[PDB]
Amino acid sequence: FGRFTERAQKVLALAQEEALRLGHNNIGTEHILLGLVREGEGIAAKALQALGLGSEKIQKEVESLIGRGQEMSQTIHYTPRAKKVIELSMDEARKLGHSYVGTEHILLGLIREGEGVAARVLNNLGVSLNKARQQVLQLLGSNETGSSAAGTNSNANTPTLDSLARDLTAIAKEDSLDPVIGRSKEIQRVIEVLSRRTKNNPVLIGEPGVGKTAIAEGLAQQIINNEVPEILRDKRVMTLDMGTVVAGTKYRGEFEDRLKKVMDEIRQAGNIILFIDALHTLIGAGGAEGAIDASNILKPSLARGELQCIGATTLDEYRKYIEKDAALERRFQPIQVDQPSVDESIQILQGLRDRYEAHHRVSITDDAIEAAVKLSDRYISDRFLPDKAIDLIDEAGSKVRLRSFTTPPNLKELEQKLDEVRKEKDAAVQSQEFEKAASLRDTEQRLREQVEDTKKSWKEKQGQENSEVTVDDIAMVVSSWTAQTETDKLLNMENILHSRVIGQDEAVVAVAKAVRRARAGLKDPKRPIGSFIFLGPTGVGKTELARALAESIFGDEESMIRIDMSEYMEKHSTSRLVGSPPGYVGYDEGGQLTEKVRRKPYSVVLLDAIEKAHPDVFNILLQVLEDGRLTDSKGRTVDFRNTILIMTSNVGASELKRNKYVGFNVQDETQNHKDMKDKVMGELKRAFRPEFINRIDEIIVFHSLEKKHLTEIVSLMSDQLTKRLKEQDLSIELTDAAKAKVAEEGVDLEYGARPLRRAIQKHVEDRLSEELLRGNIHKGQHIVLDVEDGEFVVKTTA
């Protein structure tokens, strides 16, 4: 059963009436047949009354099947047979122009389901099955429920309007024409351009691809009342439809001739409008576009002003029509068809919130719509601004009704049981195993009802909780791509960045806060969500922080571009790093930087070296840093929308290698700390050009090796060990206990913190692998190199 006619449903339900009244415990086709004759004035019922079959005549046979009867009528739903009649009736209604069904269609449906209960009832009460369907047909057919025309009611238009066309105005007489969504102020802006006749053509420019056609339908409607030029009220809008013209004509040349006929009758000037879509194509000018050079006829028609026409041209194409001249845009003039601006996005969301009705999820909240929009805008950041939006609302917009309804209670197990029976049960009936099948049926059907009750008992768990969707709902979904777990990405950013930076507690927090700030929406949203300079020791946090940003903000390790900006001046790309300068700053702008970042407009852009670089490097960084764009690659816009620009170079490093130890001399520690987290961003300022850098979120200051920043390089090296072992399926981790003992091997007074990986290798990599090869631990489980006695110990976990 589904969305059917009443008439249908009514014959069908009457079957259930017969279920108990005649006692046929499961309702077969016979009851549907009775249903048909029992609705009296239904087209089926009426048909049966012609055939002589009254409710009586049918029922006399039917009661002789089960004769009142199993009045309990156990399993008091249908059997498949009657249900088959419904599938069939539907097809017998499809047959006669009903999406739904009808009383008629079910009687027709009976015939369809031959050698079923209805069918045998009718073959016992005489009545042949096709005589019955006949009877229905001869009280059916010639279906009409429309308006059935009244023709044109103005028609100066005739020589033209024969061809070609429907006319937009026609479809708007009783408004069988969709508006559609706009881009509403654009329709007004079209009517200025429509009120002319050597600028006659509004020329709608925008992606096609946003439902441009809505604005076009706009004109017709607006041309009626109570606002629009009287001259255009005194006009008619006729569409020059390319499709009807090409069909049955099969030539471009012939198509053009028909298009000419339409233009000639347009001599009614001061009364007629032609809409020529792809107005540029017809002009056939510019590029290699010469799709059809209708231009010969079209250009003078527009120019003479004997034609008032409507233009739909493409962004570049319009240029490539007006360039030819000498009265080309004596028609076109552009007006902007909006691709929904960010606020418009919000509105779209809200509009299609409401349509979740069998989908009960978003279905609220305002804030959730906002999250959808806003969160997408800042993070991923790889789609269009309203698409981004709408998607996020629905994204969250099922998830919760589903996580609710993940099983029948936990009574998913019921169904499994009901199976075990069915088998057992089944196999028993074949063996006989009489009462051994018996009790198995009973266990089956026991289960069966029990299943079904609890499969909809978490429809209570829906009606209780399941409309919501909030900011947070959206944020988890936005995070799925990439306002709870989008703002947790922001707020606990520092925690994430510290774990993959060699201390630099200062650096981490500076970046953390700067990105989280921007990513909140109030800083830098077209210019990178972090512009940065990262100064200080490299290896000791710097590169590693760039990595940690890629990971946290964008959701991937390798969502980080990395170009060296000092090479982009050809005064370092003739030298080391980059040997060849094939044009190199030109290579970057014209190619590399712009190309890379346009692919991922949500990635860490890392432009290395910017102190010893020259002012041209800084100009490039500055445009990104102010605007969020560079225009290169012949007018391409590279979207640095919510990239993180990180420009490196260091010159404060030394203090950021003097530590805030513990016990060294407290007055050197607590004056080394504050000093390194200051000195880097001030050592920066003296070498380069300032104009780029001031357009930066925070100028990131790195630190040393503290007591404890040191032990984070030990843990970077140890984390790097543990990371390279996974691909085969050797999952190894060093506990804190082992990371502590391993850290012991990195301190001297005479040695920095970098030798640690190799000794981590000796006691972990080398040691674990030389301990595994024996056959002590399985391949394909977790291997912990731990300390559990003050010495390394390999312990195991899943």
Q: Which residues are annotated as a binding site?
A: 206-213, 536-543
Min. distance of Cβ 49 from its own copies in angstroms? 27
8 Å CB contact between 375 and 340: no
Confirm or reject binding of residue 17 to its own copies (CB under 8 A). Answer: no
Confirm or reject binding of residue 715 to its own copies (CB under 8 A). Answer: no
Single out the segment in contact with its own copies by CB under 8 A; choices: 32-40, 202-210, 653-661, 736-744: 202-210
Confirm or reject binding of residue 193 to its own copies (CB under 8 A). Answer: yes
Min. distance of Cβ 485 from its own copies in angstroms? 15
Cα–Cα distance, 633 to 589 (Å, whole number): 7
Residue 232 CB neighbours (<10 A): 18
Residue 218, H or E segment: helix 213-224
Min. distance of Cβ 192 from its own copies in angstroms? 5
Q: Site for its own copies (CB under 8 A): how many residues?
A: 221
Binders of its own copies among residues 35 to 64 (CB under 8 A) are none
Min. distance of Cβ 431 from its own copies in angstroms? 19
Burial call 660-669: b when 16+ CB within 10 Å, e when fewer: bbeeeeeeeb
Tokens at 227, concatenated:
């606002």
Confirm or reject binding of residue 768 to its own copies (CB under 8 A). Answer: yes
8 Å CB contact between 93 and 105: yes
Min. distance of Cβ 274 from its own copies in angstroms? 15
Which of 15, 43, 44, 88: binder of its own copies (CB under 8 A)?
88
Single out the segment in contact with its own copies by CB under 8 A; choices: 54-62, 135-143, 424-432, 748-756: 748-756
Side-chain half-sphere exposure of 609, counting CA atoms within 13 A:
17
Q: Which is nearer to its own copies, 127 or 297 (CB)?
A: 297
Q: Which is nearer to its own copies, 236 or 498 (CB)?
A: 236
Q: Which is nearer to its own copies, 68 or 383 (CB)?
A: 383
Q: Which is nearer to its own copies, 124 or 495 (CB)?
A: 495
> Residues with Cβ < 8 Å from 761, sequence gap 6 or more?
721
Q: Which of 45, 34, 28, 35 is nearest to 13 (CA)?
A: 35
Confirm or reject binding of residue 474 to its own copies (CB under 8 A). Answer: no
Sheet of 563-564, strand order: 563-564, 604-608, 644-648, 532-534, 698-700
Q: Please give the torsion angle defined by the CA atoms of residues 739, 740, 742 and 745, in that order, rounded to the nearest 10 degrees.
A: 150
Q: Which is nearer to its own copies, 51 or 742 (CB)?
A: 742
Min. distance of Cβ 59 from its own copies in angstroms? 25
Confirm or reject binding of residue 359 to its own copies (CB under 8 A). Answer: yes
Single out the segment in contact with its own copies by CB under 8 A; choices: 191-199, 492-500, 657-665, 787-795: 191-199
Query: Where do runs of H (alpha helix) occur along 288-338?
Result: 295-304, 319-322
Residue 66's Cβ-count burial label (10 Å; 0-12, 13-18, 19+) is buried
Cis peptide before 217 (omega within 30 of 0): no
8 Å CB contact between 378 and 519: yes
**Binding-site residues for ATP:** 206-213, 536-543
Confirm or reject binding of residue 248 to its own copies (CB under 8 A). Answer: no
Confirm or reject binding of residue 756 to its own copies (CB under 8 A). Answer: yes
Binders of its own copies among residues 412 to 451 (CB under 8 A) are 412, 415, 451
Which of 49, 75, 134, 198: binder of its own copies (CB under 8 A)?
198
> Residues with Cβ < 8 Å from 241, sequence gap 6 or more?
164, 165, 166
Instruction: Give residue 73's identity as a one-letter amino acid code.
Output: S
Q: Please, what is the angle between helix 385-404 and helix 366-378, to 10°?
A: 120
Tokens at 538, concatenated:
């490299």
Cα–Cα distance, 585 to 571 (Å, whole number): 10
Binders of its own copies among residues 149 to 178 (CB under 8 A) are 150-159, 162
Q: Over 556-588, what HEC string results?
A: CCCCECCEECCCCCCCCCCCCCCCCCCCHHHHH
Confirm or reject binding of residue 594 to its own copies (CB under 8 A). Answer: no
Min. distance of Cβ 50 from its own copies in angstroms? 26
Single out the segment in contact with its own copies by CB under 8 A; choices: 54-62, 94-102, 495-503, 650-658: 94-102
Tokens at 790, concatenated:
């003050």
Binders of its own copies among residues 646 to 705 (CB under 8 A) are 689-691, 693-699
Q: Which is nearer to its own copies, 635 or 790 (CB)?
A: 635
- Please state the φ and ψ torsions of residue 563, each to the nearest 5 degrees: -125, 140
68 in the Ramachandran plot: left (φ > 0), alpha (ψ -120 to 50) or beta?
Answer: left
Single out the segment in contact with its own copies by CB under 8 A; choices: 14-22, 23-31, 391-399, 651-659: 391-399
Confirm or reject binding of residue 733 to its own copies (CB under 8 A). Answer: no
Min. distance of Cβ 195 from its own copies in angstroms? 4
Q: What mask of x and - would describe binding to its own copies in positions 328 to 357, judged by CB under 8 A?
A: xxx--xx----xx-xx-xx-xx--x--xxx
Which of 584, 602, 661, 792: binder of its own copies (CB under 8 A)?
584
Single out the segment in contact with its own copies by CB under 8 A; choices: 46-54, 389-397, 437-445, 661-669: 389-397
8 Å CB contact between 88 and 111: no
Q: What mask of x and - would describe binding to its own copies in positions 769 to 798, judged by CB under 8 A?
A: xx-xx----xxx------------------
Single out the segment in contact with its own copies by CB under 8 A; choices: 136-144, 260-268, 670-678, 734-742: 260-268
Min. distance of Cβ 445 from its own copies in angstroms? 17
8 Å CB contact between 260 and 295: no
Tokens at 256, concatenated:
């053009």
Single out the segment in contact with its own copies by CB under 8 A; choices: 196-204, 495-503, 667-675, 702-710: 196-204
Single out the segment in contact with its own copies by CB under 8 A; choices: 29-37, 65-73, 123-131, 385-393: 385-393
Confirm or reject binding of residue 289 to its own copies (CB under 8 A). Answer: no
Cα–Cα distance, 530 to 549 (Å, whole number): 10
Min. distance of Cβ 771 from its own copies in angstroms? 8
Binders of its own copies among residues 528 to 567 (CB under 8 A) are 539, 543, 558, 564, 567
Which of 617, 680, 710, 714: binder of its own copies (CB under 8 A)?
617
Confirm or reject binding of residue 84 to its own copies (CB under 8 A). Answer: yes
Q: How many residues does the chain have?
A: 798
Which of 322, 653, 734, 737: binder of its own copies (CB under 8 A)?
322
Which of 15, 22, 51, 93: binder of its own copies (CB under 8 A)?
93
636 in the Ramachandran plot: left (φ > 0), alpha (ψ -120 to 50) or beta?
Answer: beta
Cα–Cα distance, 79 to 103 (Å, whole number): 20
Which of 68, 185, 252, 723: binder of its own copies (CB under 8 A)?
723
Place of tokens 């089956």: 444
Cα–Cα distance, 250 to 230 (Å, whole number): 40
Min. distance of Cβ 436 from its own copies in angstroms? 25
Cα–Cα distance, 56 to 38 (Å, whole number): 9
Binders of its own copies among residues 494 to 533 (CB under 8 A) are 513-514, 516-518, 520-527
Confirm or reject binding of residue 112 to its own copies (CB under 8 A). Answer: no
Cα–Cα distance, 54 to 122 (Å, whole number): 12
Confirm or reject binding of residue 231 to its own copies (CB under 8 A). Answer: yes
Q: Which is it for the CA torsion 47, 48, 49, 52, positive or negative? A: positive
Q: Which of 331, 338, 221 is nearest to 278 (CA)?
A: 331
Which of 184, 720, 796, 797: binder of its own copies (CB under 8 A)?
720
Confirm or reject binding of residue 228 to its own copies (CB under 8 A). Answer: yes
Min. distance of Cβ 695 from its own copies in angstroms? 7
Min. distance of Cβ 706 from its own copies in angstroms? 19
Instruction: Give residue 651's identity as a one-letter amino acid code.
Output: V
Residue 99's Cβ-count burial label (10 Å; 0-12, 13-18, 19+) is exposed
Q: Where are the beta strands (DSSP E) in 241-391?
A: 272-277, 309-312, 334-336
